[PDB]
Design a protein around this ligand. Sequence first.
Ligand SMILES: Cc1cc2nc3c(=O)[nH]c(=O)nc-3n(C[C@H](O)[C@H](O)[C@H](O)COP(=O)(O)OP(=O)(O)OC[C@H]3O[C@@H](n4cnc5c(N)ncnc54)[C@H](O)[C@@H]3O)c2cc1C
Ligand SMILES: Cc1cc2nc3c(=O)[nH]c(=O)nc-3n(C[C@H](O)[C@H](O)[C@H](O)COP(=O)(O)OP(=O)(O)OC[C@H]3O[C@@H](n4cnc5c(N)ncnc54)[C@H](O)[C@@H]3O)c2cc1C
Ligand SMILES: CC(C)(COP(=O)(O)OP(=O)(O)OC[C@H]1O[C@@H](n2cnc3c(N)ncnc32)[C@H](O)[C@@H]1OP(=O)(O)O)[C@@H](O)C(=O)NCCC(=O)NCCS
Ligand SMILES: CC(C)(COP(=O)(O)OP(=O)(O)OC[C@H]1O[C@@H](n2cnc3c(N)ncnc32)[C@H](O)[C@@H]1OP(=O)(O)O)[C@@H](O)C(=O)NCCC(=O)NCCS
Lengths: 442, 443
Amino acid sequence: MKKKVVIIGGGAAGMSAASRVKRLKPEWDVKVFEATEWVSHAPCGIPYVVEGLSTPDKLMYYPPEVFIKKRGIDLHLNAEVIEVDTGYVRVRGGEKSYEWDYLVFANGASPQVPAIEGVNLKGVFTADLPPDALAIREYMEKYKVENVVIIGGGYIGIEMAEAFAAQGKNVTMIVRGERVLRRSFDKEVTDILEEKLKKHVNLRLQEITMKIEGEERVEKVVTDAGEYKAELVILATGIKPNIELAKQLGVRIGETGAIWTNEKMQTSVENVYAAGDVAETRHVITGRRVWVPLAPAGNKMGYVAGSNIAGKELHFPGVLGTAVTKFMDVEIGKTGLTEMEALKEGYDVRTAFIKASTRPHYYPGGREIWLKGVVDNETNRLLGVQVVGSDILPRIDTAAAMLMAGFTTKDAFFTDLAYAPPFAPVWDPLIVLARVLKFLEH
Amino acid sequence: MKKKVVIIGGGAAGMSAASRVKRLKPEWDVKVFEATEWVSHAPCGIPYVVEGLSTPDKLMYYPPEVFIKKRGIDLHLNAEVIEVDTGYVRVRENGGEKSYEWDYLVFANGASPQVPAIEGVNLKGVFTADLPPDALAIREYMEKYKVENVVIIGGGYIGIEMAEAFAAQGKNVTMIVRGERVLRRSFDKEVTDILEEKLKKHVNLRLQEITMKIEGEERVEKVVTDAGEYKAELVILATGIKPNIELAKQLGVRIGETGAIWTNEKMQTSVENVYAAGDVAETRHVITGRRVWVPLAPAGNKMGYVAGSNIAGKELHFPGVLGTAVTKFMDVEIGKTGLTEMEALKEGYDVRTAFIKASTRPHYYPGGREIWLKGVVDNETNRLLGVQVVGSDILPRIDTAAAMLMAGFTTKDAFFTDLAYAPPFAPVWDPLIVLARVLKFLE
Ligand SMILES: Cc1cc2nc3c(=O)[nH]c(=O)nc-3n(C[C@H](O)[C@H](O)[C@H](O)COP(=O)(O)OP(=O)(O)OC[C@H]3O[C@@H](n4cnc5c(N)ncnc54)[C@H](O)[C@@H]3O)c2cc1C
Ligand SMILES: Cc1cc2nc3c(=O)[nH]c(=O)nc-3n(C[C@H](O)[C@H](O)[C@H](O)COP(=O)(O)OP(=O)(O)OC[C@H]3O[C@@H](n4cnc5c(N)ncnc54)[C@H](O)[C@@H]3O)c2cc1C
Ligand SMILES: CC(C)(COP(=O)(O)OP(=O)(O)OC[C@H]1O[C@@H](n2cnc3c(N)ncnc32)[C@H](O)[C@@H]1OP(=O)(O)O)[C@@H](O)C(=O)NCCC(=O)NCCS
Ligand SMILES: CC(C)(COP(=O)(O)OP(=O)(O)OC[C@H]1O[C@@H](n2cnc3c(N)ncnc32)[C@H](O)[C@@H]1OP(=O)(O)O)[C@@H](O)C(=O)NCCC(=O)NCCS
């Protein structure tokens, strides 16, 4: 029998789920309901759209007709799913009902709303979806901005901060405690991003935002600490998964806050799946259920969800917590457990923090790179690697493979990594790190 | 007790071994005999010093003072090992000869360029690019004599790296390649073709030519091949290299089928207490398990490390090599790991391949260059046999793939590996992941 598949949300995870199902089952009716004008879009591009490095149409991978005419997917744009119950969906010109044999929550995560005064003032913005990027640029046109404040010291906030310093503004970051990205990175890595950050940005640590002032336009921001002139505000205080439709069916919600899924991306409710930013996943090292709202996993989850619906078993092994960002000259990145995390999990750990060069001592253009590694004292296995400086991608990606596989410090050392003078030093920083840790054996 | 450890060769392999031994056994007598004046040197920097992009003193990692004073190695510079016998080594240093007892011996005397049977190889103006003294000799010749036209006899990596060194200096460069294509021995056609496009535009690329003779006055002026003549004031012979095994043979040391000194995981040779590390040594291949010869720097260094540890009674095993290597001509990056399609087929594998094109950034973020990937896969097990990468930003794809191959990843293992994404780094689907997907998990 043909079967009716319904997908809520037309982002990365949603279309990956949509494509996969139709690809495997062309005779099946695959509907996607997206609330906005946007499909196959990238929230990752926003900062760079706003910076103006590029345009907002380039936050699409594929246009609608590629999905409808070229891939046979019944794509409903401007369509908001408002209710769900067993076997039925309710959507909004018009408010119609649809039946499903399978359901995918490819539903994403909306930004967290801190309840303080002036949050609703023309002038205050939160960066999540592509319509937000156009709204900020449509604003900087209708008004004249020179002072910008950013509440949040995470990555979303840093990328937005950079997106304004490049446009030559007086930017102020207000983070709620002792360091930037304290939740995800360790101090000795975070310090090196901050040296560069302090300089190009008014970094205000250990502060809480109290109110936002203005008329109908924003004009000032007050914190427990001091006042700052501001004509535009970005709020990046974290995000939370859109779980409100999920509960509508008493789908299990994870310790994490996101929708509980298994290896097949199935939920606690039969024929109901979940993928992307709404979905809680598994950690590859730890085995703990964890929430890591990032793009590559989002897509893979959609791919995995699509496959199981179309009746070919596939497992998603989980995630490593691999992530990477940048402030100007400085590349920041991790994969696996941070020292803090590894401690929280009750591991017995040793660590190492080294500096190296990015090129051999002869070939020019050699820049600095720092690496912190975390190792389990009992097994010698790597638990995580953090890298900062220049040219950190080969290291992070490489270490991610090694972790996936459960490499030891010794396994890493003898791995045949490449060397040429225009590429890396003789002793690759990753294998240097792995040597400084040592291979202990009772 | 307090053993005597003698190491022939002061390159990466020798110094790694000497350092390791002394580090584990500080009460031991450790001697390094190096023929030249250079210790801890980088022959890998010869092309870049020739280009003038770097000074020669930059080829040394540590000054010899560090090994002697700071580490305790009895380093003997300008000292050549002439004969080897069980227990003894004959060395020529201060014009004369002398004798040294060894309890442990390491061959780290590397590999030297193959001397071709052409007439006129010994004219002045003809150089080999193998050791640091060569790089000086090349600059000093360009200083003493006017050079406009440069001819490279090559095809392989050194050749291309030497060819580039002369081009960006404005010189007129010609490459003589025996048979169909550049780098034909180590890469597949569809990979080298992309480099070759870039080569021909900045090089007089001459394929399927056997250089017959090098002619000139007292010094070089022309190169004659069975294809024709080429005006040349300077010649680089880079037709391949051979392991220095002639003094191993005196000891009765087993030589592997590759031509290099046979070893095991411990870097031990056929002869008791005798070791070999670096470009002299034959090692294991991580995938095939076959004996292989890959004269490259990171392996040579680890081989020295491993040899040192075993001499000093701390057992360690070198797992072998993947055939991982990387080069660049201009802004074209070329690199491989594992087996090519040709190697795999030669080894009798049931093989499927894929060749894809992608970008280094997403279509929003700018600066996106082109990247091409080739993957070889075993049909029966779904495991990656090898990956070749060409274009821009290829280091992540090779290093990551190397780890995967080292470990025995399948295409599905590769596909589901948590690789990093941010716009200034890569596209949402890393080109490696696309390769793994286009390859397929057929079972
Ligand atoms: C500014 C920013 C920068 C980022 N940078 C990176 C990065 O560098 N690297 C990285 O890996 N990740 C990054 N991410 C995260 C990445 O964008 C997400 O993890 C990924 O896009 C998740 O895809 P998704 O389809 O699951 O959710 P989304 O991409 O958010 O798609 C969900 C869609 O569902 C729609 N929807 C919501 N509710 C309904 C409803 N009730 N009815 C119908 N439709 C609905 C929404 O309109 C939305 O379009 C970034 C995110 C942001 C916000
Ligand atoms: C032009 C060029 C470019 C290269 N580029 C790269 C690259 O990009 N990446 C890479 O991984 N590898 C590269 N290599 C290879 C790399 O240099 C070698 O694999 C590495 O140096 C091997 O170290 P080794 O000590 O075994 O040999 P060597 O570094 O050559 O050391 C051997 C030493 O032993 C000495 N010796 C020889 N005979 C005697 C004797 N009779 N008595 C005493 N001493 C003796 C020699 O003088 C020599 O200094 C390149 C090589 C060349 C020539
Ligand atoms: C593109 C998207 C819809 C997924 O669709 P997908 O079909 O799984 O991925 P592709 O369109 O690239 O793949 C189509 C086919 O081409 C092949 N392919 C992809 N790239 C290729 C390449 N460069 N060379 C050769 N083949 C390629 C794939 O193998 C696939 O084959 P298959 O259908 O048999 O599996 C989804 O990832 C998306 O919405 N992306 C944009 C949004 C986003 O990811 N943003 C990032 C979050 S901020
Ligand atoms: C340098 C050489 C002698 C090896 O020496 P080594 O002692 O084994 O390696 P290092 O010099 O880095 O040793 C430094 C020590 O400090 C440690 N260290 C700590 N932090 C470090 C850092 N951030 N970077 C490098 N080493 C660090 C190393 O782990 C090592 O520890 P160990 O003594 O306990 O083993 C050898 O590689 C050589 O001669 N190289 C020159 C030629 C070459 O590199 N290649 C030739 C062709 S390109």
